[PDB]
Design a protein around this ligand. Structure first.
Ligand code: NA
Lengths: 298, 298
């Protein structure tokens, strides 16, 4: 089985009214205006489903599929019976609703892929499909996923899933996976994946980038919110960031950019914290970095 | 026909003593100790050949080949019959010899692929041969090139050229080429190519990065030196830089890096001047960037 990278439950609550600390510590709002808050980009969330009617998520969700044996399986039913999937969605794209929470890409859309059961586990074949499907899907107007995000891991170097990964990347999809806390090694170990480690809000602890992962408030079941801590919680911040990054980079270059170019655009928005490269990769996600260094010479 | 992106021959000097301003402004010397001055890396200079015995170059050249009909073409004779090739080579990697000049990677090795005639031009196929030649080449001890540099352009999108290029990129050779001033479009225009634009030392102006291109002093024929101005002159700074960057990045990450990751390693060493990305790409080559941003938050 491939499964949710373990994390801690901290809180469940019924009410929030805030921009999470991780959304702002990563400098998303500083770039919202120039990025149109991620409009025109879709993130394929590969996870346990989503609460499709959550007040924070409903106007941001556009489709989803269920690749699981849960609920039949009715492919049309990609409700969350775990909760983790809904939490991810929130960090990526919760809307400015005048309350609850707000995501890194508050104007991007979500395509929900349930490839995990309620128990947070999934057959690997489902993950391979999830990746392939997200690549091949186009919305009714021509729209497509440039971003995949998962916070799952598996002990196994499975050729079929490595293939899906190579397939996504050669078709221009950024593949974001949370670093296994080997047991959770794949698909994050794969050279072509963007692997994301975690730090806390004090910026304390094979990855490319680190983002916030301790005490991350997001949406949760029954139209509520939960606070979760762990590695799995850093990945959705980067998935969101890419929505923003793709928009601004392509607008600046006035040109389409490849998966390769897009990756370089992400990692140049990573400020090293002073930890080692194995600990932090290229550093912490600072979305305004380019603008801070523009003009700055010796 | 493909030819050298046109340049002004501003001057012919015959003796020097100095690190060139292009080499310092790019901040190569700040990164010299940690990159070990480029040792271990080999750059395939695809050009007009090189004065093999240049006092500044001889110790840096481990081999070459002549894929042209000049000199026979005796494939063993890669001597320069133009001057440009010797110039490139000096910027990429002239030696610290306490006179003449010194290159961006003064301890990197040079393989000299002469695929252009004394007249600055070459049959498209020669360039394709030359790309495929540098990728496949193995040393006496199993050395290979990770870096390809050229300053040429042709009007024609020929697939044999593009495939050659894709083939260096899937084998993790970085391919570096100058963005000419539609007649010099190829191969610079190719997505997988690192296209280098030019600025002057005042940082005044489909590209990736910009580097110095005006009044560039380097090695010339007859053991001398010359100063040239033009787009073609910025590329070598970048290919030099790569030798440097591969060593310091592979050292920090404790691991081989792919050509995609190396790419990212280059563009996060580019500071933007404050043009649009269209005009300047990712910014001006600044090797010391990561050091200076380490530790630096809102
Ligand atoms: Na010298």
């Amino acid at each position: 089985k491939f499964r949710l990278i373990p994390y801690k439950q901290v809180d469940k609550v019924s009410a929030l009214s805030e921009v999470p600390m991780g959304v702002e510590i990563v400098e998303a709002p500083a770039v919202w205006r120039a990025s149109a808050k991620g409009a025109g980009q879709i993130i394929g969330v590969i996870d346990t489903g989503c609460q499709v009617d959550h007040p924070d998520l409903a106007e941001r969700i556009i489709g989803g599929v269920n690749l699981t044996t849960d609920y039949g399986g009715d492919e049309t039913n990609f409700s969350d019976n775990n909760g983790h999937g809904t939490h991810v969605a929130g960090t990526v794209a919760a809307a400015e609703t005048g309350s609850g929470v707000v995501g890194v890409a508050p104007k991007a859309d979500l395509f929900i892929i349930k490839a995990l059961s309620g128990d947070g586990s999934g057959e690997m074949g489902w993950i391979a499909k999830a990746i392939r499907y997200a690549v091949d899907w186009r919305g009714p107007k021509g729209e497509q996923m440039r971003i995949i995000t998962m916070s799952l891991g598996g002990p196994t170097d499975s050729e079929e899933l490595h293939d899906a990964v190579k397939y996504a990347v050669s078709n221009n999809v950024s593949v974001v996976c949370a670093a296994g806390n080997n047991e959770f090694a794949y698909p994050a170990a794969y050279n072509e994946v963007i692997a994301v480690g975690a730090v806390d809000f004090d910026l304390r602890l094979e990855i490319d980038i680190v983002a916030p992962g301790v005490g991350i408030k997001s949406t949760y079941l029954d139209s509520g919110y939960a606070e979760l801590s762990g590695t799995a919680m850093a990945a959705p911040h980067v998935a969101g960031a890419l929505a923003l990054i793709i928009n601004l980079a392509e607008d600046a270059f006035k040109r389409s950019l490849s998966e390769t170019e897009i990756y370089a655009q992400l990692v140049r928005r990573a400020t090293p914290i002073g930890f080692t490269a194995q600990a932090e990769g290229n550093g912490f996600l600072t979305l305004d970095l380019v603008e801070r260094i523009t003009g700055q010479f010796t």
